[PDB]
CSV table of C-alpha atoms (C1' of nucleotides) and ligand atoms in Angstrom, one decimal:
chain,number,residue,atom,x,y,z
A,11,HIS,CA,-70.5,17.5,-81.8
A,12,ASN,CA,-73.0,15.6,-84.1
A,13,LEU,CA,-75.2,18.4,-85.3
A,14,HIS,CA,-77.1,18.6,-88.6
A,15,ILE,CA,-80.1,19.1,-86.9
A,16,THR,CA,-78.9,21.9,-84.7
A,17,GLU,CA,-78.2,23.8,-88.0
A,18,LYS,CA,-82.1,23.9,-88.8
A,19,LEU,CA,-83.4,24.6,-85.3
A,20,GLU,CA,-81.4,27.5,-85.0
A,21,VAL,CA,-83.1,29.0,-88.1
A,22,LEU,CA,-86.4,28.6,-86.3
A,23,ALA,CA,-84.7,29.9,-83.0
A,24,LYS,CA,-83.7,32.9,-84.5
A,25,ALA,CA,-87.1,33.5,-86.3
A,26,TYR,CA,-89.0,33.2,-82.7
A,27,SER,CA,-86.4,35.5,-81.2
A,28,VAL,CA,-86.5,38.3,-83.5
A,29,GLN,CA,-90.1,38.2,-83.8
A,30,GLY,CA,-90.2,38.6,-79.8
A,31,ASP,CA,-91.4,35.1,-78.7
A,32,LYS,CA,-88.4,35.1,-76.3
A,33,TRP,CA,-89.7,32.1,-74.2
A,34,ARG,CA,-90.0,29.9,-77.3
A,35,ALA,CA,-86.7,31.1,-78.5
A,36,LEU,CA,-85.5,30.1,-74.9
A,37,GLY,CA,-86.7,26.4,-75.2
A,38,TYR,CA,-85.1,26.2,-78.6
A,39,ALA,CA,-81.5,27.9,-77.4
A,40,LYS,CA,-81.4,25.0,-74.3
A,41,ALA,CA,-82.5,22.3,-76.6
A,42,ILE,CA,-79.6,23.2,-79.0
A,43,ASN,CA,-76.9,23.7,-76.5
A,44,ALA,CA,-77.8,20.4,-75.5
A,45,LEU,CA,-77.4,18.8,-78.9
A,46,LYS,CA,-73.9,20.3,-79.6
A,47,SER,CA,-72.9,18.3,-76.2
A,48,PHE,CA,-74.2,14.9,-76.5
A,49,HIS,CA,-71.4,12.5,-77.1
A,50,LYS,CA,-72.9,10.3,-80.1
A,51,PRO,CA,-75.4,11.7,-82.5
A,52,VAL,CA,-79.1,11.3,-81.7
A,53,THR,CA,-80.6,8.0,-82.8
A,54,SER,CA,-84.0,7.2,-81.6
A,55,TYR,CA,-86.7,9.5,-81.0
A,56,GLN,CA,-86.6,7.9,-77.8
A,57,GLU,CA,-82.9,8.9,-77.4
A,58,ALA,CA,-84.2,12.4,-77.7
A,59,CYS,CA,-86.9,12.7,-74.9
A,60,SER,CA,-84.0,11.1,-72.7
A,61,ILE,CA,-82.1,14.2,-72.7
A,62,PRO,CA,-82.2,17.2,-70.4
A,63,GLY,CA,-83.8,19.9,-72.7
A,64,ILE,CA,-85.5,17.8,-75.1
A,65,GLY,CA,-89.3,16.9,-75.1
A,66,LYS,CA,-92.1,15.9,-77.1
A,67,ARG,CA,-92.5,18.8,-79.6
A,68,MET,CA,-88.6,18.9,-80.1
A,69,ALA,CA,-88.2,15.5,-80.2
A,70,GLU,CA,-90.6,14.8,-83.0
A,71,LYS,CA,-89.0,17.7,-85.1
A,72,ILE,CA,-85.7,16.2,-84.6
A,73,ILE,CA,-87.4,13.1,-86.1
A,74,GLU,CA,-88.5,15.0,-88.7
A,75,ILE,CA,-85.1,16.2,-89.7
A,76,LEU,CA,-83.2,12.7,-89.5
A,77,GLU,CA,-86.4,10.9,-91.2
A,78,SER,CA,-87.7,13.4,-93.7
A,79,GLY,CA,-84.4,15.3,-94.2
A,80,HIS,CA,-86.1,18.7,-93.7
A,81,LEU,CA,-88.3,20.5,-91.0
A,82,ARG,CA,-91.6,22.0,-92.6
A,83,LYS,CA,-91.9,24.8,-90.2
A,84,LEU,CA,-89.2,26.4,-91.8
A,85,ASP,CA,-91.2,27.1,-94.7
A,86,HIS,CA,-93.6,29.3,-92.7
A,87,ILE,CA,-91.0,31.6,-91.5
A,88,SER,CA,-92.1,34.9,-91.8
A,89,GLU,CA,-90.5,36.6,-94.9
A,90,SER,CA,-90.1,39.7,-92.8
A,91,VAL,CA,-87.4,38.2,-90.6
A,92,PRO,CA,-84.2,38.9,-92.4
A,93,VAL,CA,-85.2,42.4,-92.2
A,94,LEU,CA,-86.4,42.2,-88.5
A,95,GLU,CA,-82.9,40.7,-88.1
A,96,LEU,CA,-81.1,43.8,-89.5
A,97,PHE,CA,-83.0,46.2,-87.8
A,98,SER,CA,-82.7,44.7,-84.4
A,99,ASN,CA,-79.0,44.5,-85.0
A,100,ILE,CA,-78.7,48.0,-84.5
A,101,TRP,CA,-77.6,48.7,-80.9
A,102,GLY,CA,-80.9,50.0,-78.8
A,103,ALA,CA,-83.2,48.7,-81.3
A,104,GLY,CA,-85.1,45.2,-80.3
A,105,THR,CA,-88.0,43.4,-81.4
A,106,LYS,CA,-90.8,45.9,-80.9
A,107,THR,CA,-89.1,48.9,-82.6
A,108,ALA,CA,-87.8,46.3,-85.6
A,109,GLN,CA,-91.5,45.6,-85.9
A,110,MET,CA,-92.6,49.2,-85.9
A,111,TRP,CA,-90.6,50.1,-88.7
A,112,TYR,CA,-91.0,47.0,-90.8
A,113,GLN,CA,-94.7,47.9,-90.3
A,114,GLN,CA,-93.9,51.3,-91.4
A,115,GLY,CA,-92.7,49.8,-94.7
A,116,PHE,CA,-88.7,50.1,-93.9
A,117,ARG,CA,-86.8,47.7,-95.3
A,118,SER,CA,-83.1,48.6,-95.5
A,119,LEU,CA,-80.6,50.5,-93.3
A,120,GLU,CA,-80.9,53.2,-95.8
A,121,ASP,CA,-84.8,53.3,-95.3
A,122,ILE,CA,-83.8,53.9,-91.3
A,123,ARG,CA,-81.0,56.3,-92.3
A,124,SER,CA,-83.4,58.6,-94.1
A,125,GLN,CA,-87.0,58.0,-92.9
A,126,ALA,CA,-87.1,56.4,-89.2
A,127,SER,CA,-87.3,58.2,-86.0
A,128,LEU,CA,-84.3,57.2,-83.9
A,129,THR,CA,-83.4,57.7,-80.4
A,130,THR,CA,-80.2,58.8,-79.5
A,131,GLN,CA,-78.9,55.5,-78.7
A,132,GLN,CA,-79.9,53.9,-82.2
A,133,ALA,CA,-78.6,56.7,-83.9
A,134,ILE,CA,-75.0,55.7,-82.6
A,135,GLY,CA,-75.8,52.0,-82.9
A,136,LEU,CA,-76.4,52.7,-86.8
A,137,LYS,CA,-73.2,54.9,-87.2
A,138,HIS,CA,-71.3,51.8,-85.6
A,139,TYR,CA,-73.5,49.4,-87.4
A,140,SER,CA,-70.8,47.1,-88.9
A,141,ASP,CA,-68.0,47.9,-85.9
A,142,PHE,CA,-70.5,46.4,-83.4
A,143,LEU,CA,-71.3,43.1,-85.4
A,144,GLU,CA,-67.6,42.6,-85.4
A,145,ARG,CA,-65.8,40.8,-82.2
A,146,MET,CA,-62.5,42.0,-81.1
A,147,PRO,CA,-59.4,40.2,-80.7
A,148,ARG,CA,-58.8,39.2,-77.1
A,149,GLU,CA,-55.3,41.5,-77.5
A,150,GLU,CA,-57.6,44.6,-78.3
A,151,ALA,CA,-59.6,43.8,-75.3
A,152,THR,CA,-56.4,43.6,-73.1
A,153,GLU,CA,-55.6,47.2,-74.5
A,154,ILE,CA,-58.7,48.5,-73.9
A,155,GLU,CA,-58.7,47.4,-70.1
A,156,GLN,CA,-55.5,48.9,-69.6
A,157,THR,CA,-56.3,52.2,-71.0
A,158,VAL,CA,-59.2,52.2,-68.4
A,159,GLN,CA,-57.2,50.9,-65.7
A,160,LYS,CA,-54.3,53.5,-66.6
A,161,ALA,CA,-56.9,56.3,-66.5
A,162,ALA,CA,-58.6,55.2,-63.3
A,163,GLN,CA,-55.4,54.4,-61.4
A,164,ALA,CA,-54.5,58.1,-62.1
A,165,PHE,CA,-57.2,59.1,-59.8
A,166,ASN,CA,-56.0,56.4,-57.3
A,167,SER,CA,-53.3,53.9,-57.8
A,168,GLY,CA,-55.4,51.5,-55.7
A,169,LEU,CA,-58.4,51.1,-57.8
A,170,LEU,CA,-58.8,47.7,-59.2
A,171,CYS,CA,-59.8,47.5,-62.9
A,172,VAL,CA,-60.4,43.9,-64.1
A,173,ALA,CA,-61.9,43.1,-67.5
A,174,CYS,CA,-65.0,40.5,-66.8
A,175,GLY,CA,-67.2,39.0,-69.3
A,176,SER,CA,-66.3,36.9,-72.4
A,177,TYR,CA,-62.5,38.1,-71.8
A,178,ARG,CA,-62.4,37.0,-68.2
A,179,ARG,CA,-63.9,33.4,-69.4
A,180,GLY,CA,-61.1,33.3,-71.8
A,181,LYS,CA,-62.5,33.6,-75.2
A,182,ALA,CA,-60.3,34.4,-78.0
A,183,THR,CA,-62.7,37.4,-79.3
A,184,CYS,CA,-64.6,39.8,-77.5
A,185,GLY,CA,-68.1,41.4,-78.5
A,186,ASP,CA,-67.1,44.2,-76.1
A,187,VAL,CA,-65.1,45.0,-73.0
A,188,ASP,CA,-66.8,44.8,-69.5
A,189,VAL,CA,-64.7,46.7,-66.8
A,190,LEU,CA,-65.5,46.3,-63.3
A,191,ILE,CA,-63.8,49.0,-61.1
A,192,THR,CA,-63.6,49.0,-57.1
A,193,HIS,CA,-61.2,49.7,-54.5
A,194,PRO,CA,-60.1,47.1,-51.6
A,195,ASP,CA,-60.5,50.1,-49.1
A,196,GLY,CA,-64.4,49.9,-49.5
A,197,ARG,CA,-64.4,53.8,-49.9
A,198,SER,CA,-62.0,54.9,-52.7
A,199,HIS,CA,-64.1,53.9,-55.2
A,200,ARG,CA,-66.7,56.7,-54.7
A,201,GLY,CA,-66.6,60.3,-56.4
A,202,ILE,CA,-64.2,58.5,-59.2
A,203,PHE,CA,-66.4,57.4,-62.2
A,204,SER,CA,-67.9,60.6,-63.7
A,205,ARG,CA,-64.1,62.0,-63.6
A,206,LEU,CA,-62.9,58.9,-65.2
A,207,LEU,CA,-65.4,58.9,-67.9
A,208,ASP,CA,-64.5,62.8,-68.3
A,209,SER,CA,-60.6,62.0,-68.7
A,210,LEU,CA,-61.1,59.3,-71.3
A,211,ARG,CA,-63.6,61.4,-73.1
A,212,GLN,CA,-60.9,64.2,-73.1
A,213,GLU,CA,-58.2,61.8,-74.3
A,214,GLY,CA,-60.5,61.2,-77.3
A,215,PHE,CA,-60.8,57.5,-76.4
A,216,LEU,CA,-64.5,57.5,-75.4
A,217,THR,CA,-66.2,58.7,-78.6
A,218,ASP,CA,-70.3,58.0,-77.9
A,219,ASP,CA,-72.2,57.5,-74.6
A,220,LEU,CA,-75.1,55.2,-74.9
A,221,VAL,CA,-76.1,54.7,-71.1
A,222,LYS,CA,-74.9,56.7,-68.0
A,223,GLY,CA,-76.2,55.6,-64.7
A,224,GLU,CA,-74.9,56.3,-61.2
A,225,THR,CA,-72.6,53.4,-61.1
A,226,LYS,CA,-72.9,51.8,-64.8
A,227,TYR,CA,-71.7,53.2,-68.1
A,228,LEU,CA,-72.3,51.6,-71.4
A,229,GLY,CA,-70.3,53.4,-74.4
A,230,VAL,CA,-68.2,53.3,-77.3
A,231,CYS,CA,-64.6,53.8,-77.5
A,232,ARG,CA,-61.7,53.5,-80.1
A,233,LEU,CA,-57.9,52.9,-79.4
A,234,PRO,CA,-55.7,55.3,-81.2
A,235,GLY,CA,-53.9,55.3,-84.4
A,236,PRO,CA,-54.8,53.8,-88.0
A,237,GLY,CA,-57.0,50.6,-88.6
A,238,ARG,CA,-58.8,50.9,-85.4
A,239,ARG,CA,-62.5,50.2,-85.1
A,240,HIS,CA,-65.0,51.4,-82.4
A,241,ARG,CA,-65.5,49.1,-79.6
A,242,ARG,CA,-68.5,48.9,-77.2
A,243,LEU,CA,-67.3,49.3,-73.5
A,244,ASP,CA,-69.2,48.9,-70.3
A,245,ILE,CA,-67.8,49.8,-67.1
A,246,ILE,CA,-69.6,49.6,-63.7
A,247,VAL,CA,-68.0,50.7,-60.4
A,248,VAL,CA,-69.0,48.8,-57.2
A,249,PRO,CA,-68.3,49.1,-53.5
A,250,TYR,CA,-65.5,46.5,-52.4
A,251,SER,CA,-68.1,45.1,-50.2
A,252,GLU,CA,-69.9,43.8,-53.4
A,253,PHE,CA,-66.8,42.8,-55.3
A,254,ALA,CA,-67.3,38.7,-55.2
A,255,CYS,CA,-71.1,39.1,-56.5
A,256,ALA,CA,-70.2,41.6,-58.9
A,257,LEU,CA,-67.2,40.0,-60.4
A,258,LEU,CA,-69.5,36.8,-60.2
A,259,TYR,CA,-72.3,38.8,-62.1
A,260,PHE,CA,-70.1,40.8,-64.8
A,261,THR,CA,-68.1,37.5,-65.5
A,262,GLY,CA,-71.3,35.4,-66.4
A,263,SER,CA,-71.8,33.8,-68.9
A,264,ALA,CA,-75.6,35.2,-69.1
A,265,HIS,CA,-77.0,31.5,-69.2
A,266,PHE,CA,-74.6,30.7,-66.3
A,267,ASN,CA,-75.8,33.5,-64.2
A,268,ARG,CA,-79.3,32.6,-64.9
A,269,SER,CA,-78.9,28.9,-64.0
A,270,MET,CA,-77.0,30.2,-60.8
A,271,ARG,CA,-79.5,32.4,-59.7
A,272,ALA,CA,-82.5,29.9,-60.4
A,273,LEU,CA,-80.6,27.4,-58.4
A,274,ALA,CA,-80.4,30.3,-55.5
A,275,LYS,CA,-84.3,30.7,-55.6
A,276,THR,CA,-84.4,26.9,-54.7
A,277,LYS,CA,-82.6,27.1,-52.1
A,278,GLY,CA,-84.2,30.0,-50.6
A,279,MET,CA,-81.7,32.5,-51.1
A,280,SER,CA,-81.6,35.2,-54.1
A,281,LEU,CA,-78.4,36.2,-56.0
A,282,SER,CA,-77.5,39.7,-57.7
A,283,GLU,CA,-74.7,41.5,-58.6
A,284,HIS,CA,-74.8,43.2,-55.1
A,285,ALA,CA,-75.2,40.3,-52.9
A,286,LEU,CA,-76.2,36.8,-52.1
A,287,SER,CA,-79.3,36.9,-49.6
A,288,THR,CA,-81.6,34.9,-47.8
A,289,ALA,CA,-85.3,35.6,-49.9
A,290,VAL,CA,-87.7,38.1,-48.2
A,302,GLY,CA,-83.5,38.8,-46.3
A,303,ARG,CA,-80.2,38.4,-44.8
A,304,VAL,CA,-77.2,39.3,-46.6
A,305,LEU,CA,-74.8,36.0,-46.6
A,306,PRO,CA,-70.9,37.3,-46.5
A,307,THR,CA,-69.5,36.5,-49.6
A,308,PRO,CA,-65.8,37.8,-49.6
A,309,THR,CA,-64.8,35.8,-52.8
A,310,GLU,CA,-66.7,33.9,-55.4
A,311,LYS,CA,-66.0,30.7,-54.0
A,312,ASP,CA,-67.9,31.7,-51.0
A,313,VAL,CA,-70.6,32.3,-53.1
A,314,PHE,CA,-70.5,28.8,-54.7
A,315,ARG,CA,-70.0,27.0,-51.3
A,316,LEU,CA,-73.1,28.7,-49.8
A,317,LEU,CA,-75.2,27.4,-52.9
A,318,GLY,CA,-73.8,23.9,-52.5
A,319,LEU,CA,-71.7,23.7,-55.7
A,320,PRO,CA,-68.0,23.1,-56.3
A,321,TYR,CA,-66.1,26.3,-57.5
A,322,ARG,CA,-65.9,26.9,-61.3
A,323,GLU,CA,-63.0,29.0,-63.2
A,324,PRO,CA,-64.3,31.6,-65.4
A,325,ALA,CA,-63.4,29.4,-68.2
A,326,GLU,CA,-65.9,26.9,-67.0
A,327,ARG,CA,-68.8,28.9,-67.0
A,328,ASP,CA,-69.0,29.9,-70.7
A,329,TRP,CA,-72.6,28.7,-71.0
B,1,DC,C1',-101.1,26.4,-65.5
B,2,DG,C1',-97.3,29.1,-65.7
B,3,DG,C1',-92.3,30.2,-64.5
B,4,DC,C1',-88.6,30.4,-67.5
B,5,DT,C1',-82.8,36.0,-63.2
B,6,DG,C1',-82.4,40.0,-61.4
B,7,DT,C1',-80.9,44.9,-61.8
B,8,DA,C1',-80.9,49.6,-64.2
B,9,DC,C1',-81.5,53.4,-67.7
B,10,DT,C1',-84.4,56.0,-71.5
B,11,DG,C1',-87.9,58.9,-72.5
C,1,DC,C1',-94.6,52.4,-67.7
C,2,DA,C1',-92.6,49.5,-72.1
C,3,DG,C1',-88.6,48.8,-74.3
C,4,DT,C1',-83.7,47.6,-74.5
C,5,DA,C1',-79.9,46.4,-72.2
C,6,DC,C1',-75.8,44.0,-68.9
D,1,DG,C1',-90.2,25.9,-76.7
D,2,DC,C1',-88.7,23.2,-71.7
D,3,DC,C1',-89.9,21.5,-66.8
D,4,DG,C1',-92.4,20.9,-62.5
E,401,ZAN,N1,-79.3,38.5,-69.0
E,401,ZAN,C1,-78.4,38.6,-68.1
E,401,ZAN,N2,-78.4,38.2,-66.8
E,401,ZAN,C2,-77.3,37.9,-66.1
E,401,ZAN,N3,-76.2,38.6,-66.3
E,401,ZAN,C3,-76.1,39.2,-67.5
E,401,ZAN,C4,-77.1,38.9,-68.6
E,401,ZAN,N4,-76.4,39.5,-69.8
E,401,ZAN,C5,-75.0,40.0,-69.5
E,401,ZAN,N5,-74.8,39.4,-68.2
E,401,ZAN,C6,-73.8,39.7,-67.5
E,401,ZAN,O1,-72.7,41.0,-68.0
E,401,ZAN,C7,-71.5,40.4,-68.9
E,401,ZAN,C8,-71.5,41.1,-70.0
E,401,ZAN,O2,-72.6,40.9,-70.8
E,401,ZAN,P1,-72.2,40.8,-72.4
E,401,ZAN,O3,-73.4,41.5,-73.1
E,401,ZAN,O4,-71.0,41.9,-72.5
E,401,ZAN,N6,-71.8,39.4,-72.8
E,401,ZAN,P2,-70.0,38.7,-72.7
E,401,ZAN,O5,-70.3,37.1,-72.0
E,401,ZAN,O6,-69.2,39.5,-72.3
E,401,ZAN,O7,-70.0,38.3,-74.4
E,401,ZAN,P3,-69.6,39.4,-75.5
E,401,ZAN,O8,-69.5,40.9,-75.1
E,401,ZAN,O9,-68.0,38.8,-76.1
E,401,ZAN,O10,-70.3,39.4,-76.7
E,401,ZAN,C9,-72.0,39.0,-69.1
E,401,ZAN,O11,-71.0,38.0,-69.2
E,401,ZAN,C10,-72.4,38.3,-68.0
E,401,ZAN,O12,-71.9,38.2,-66.9
E,402,MN,MN1,-68.8,41.3,-72.7
E,403,MN,MN1,-71.2,44.3,-71.9
E,404,MN,MN1,-65.7,53.0,-86.8
E,405,NA,NA1,-80.4,45.9,-80.8
DNA sequence: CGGCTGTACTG
DNA sequence: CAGTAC
DNA sequence: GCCG
């Protein structure tokens, strides 16, 4: 993991990200995910271009870090960037909102609180600003999953509730909990969603709602008792017929999903949380996750092997 | 030159 | 729709 | 940014 170059790149990568240059930030993200994986630290400016994810521009930049010791572009990073990052860490506010607030003269969360116009979601994000920057211990994610499962299985004991995301990928900490809910009978998943949230809300577990769709919920919960933080909770309810693809999707990682979906498109297919399809298409049968891998000509990967 | 994943709330 | 998010 |  020879990475004294990456450190300086990530500063630039972050800068592009918060300023909304998502594609350049994407290039940097992949160039960096590479350097933290090359066996022996990079030596030659040719050793660079001989790596997947690094080209003429990135290579010559790496050659500036090694040779010179520091990259000059860093010195041209707008001074607004730290403030933009602060604002964009409010849930529900992205690059465009942060830049607008910044143009309006706002510089601190006190400025936002007192003077900014906030959406319903942003007001919740700001209230829980600190909490939402903390990742929870794996054990707390378990407790949250079980709270949801216990409350759901009370409408129907056959309902499957499974924590996906970083949890299923085996991480020691989780930014939130992602709970996928279904029923193996392909039908009992219906007419449950709204009742579930109502009971979780009734028992004081759900504290705030961010997004409420027909089959997806993004919100905020807090386990009972002292010393508890507010945690983000996302729930989706899917018909059993879509279980494997939904599980695959909601497990990720995000970068893994993107790569897998890109691959599917090259093979004349389309992959979503609903189905693996032939391009516009026929829905290919995917009873299990393994079926999706096999249809794409891929060796199966355990969730921990998908942590990209 | 131009895609870089595919989907779904909010207002 | 643009913006934000999973 | 990267790559085809
Ligand atoms: N941009 C995306 N494209 C495709 N799938 C995504 C994307 N973003 C999130 N997902 C899927 O939704 C799941 C939850 O997204 P999350 O935003 O919850 N990220 P996750 O990996 O769980 O990490 P932390 O909660 O511990 O920070 C991800 O693991 C992916 O499986
Ligand atoms: Mn998550
Ligand atoms: Mn999530
Ligand atoms: Mn709190
Ligand atoms: Na945000």
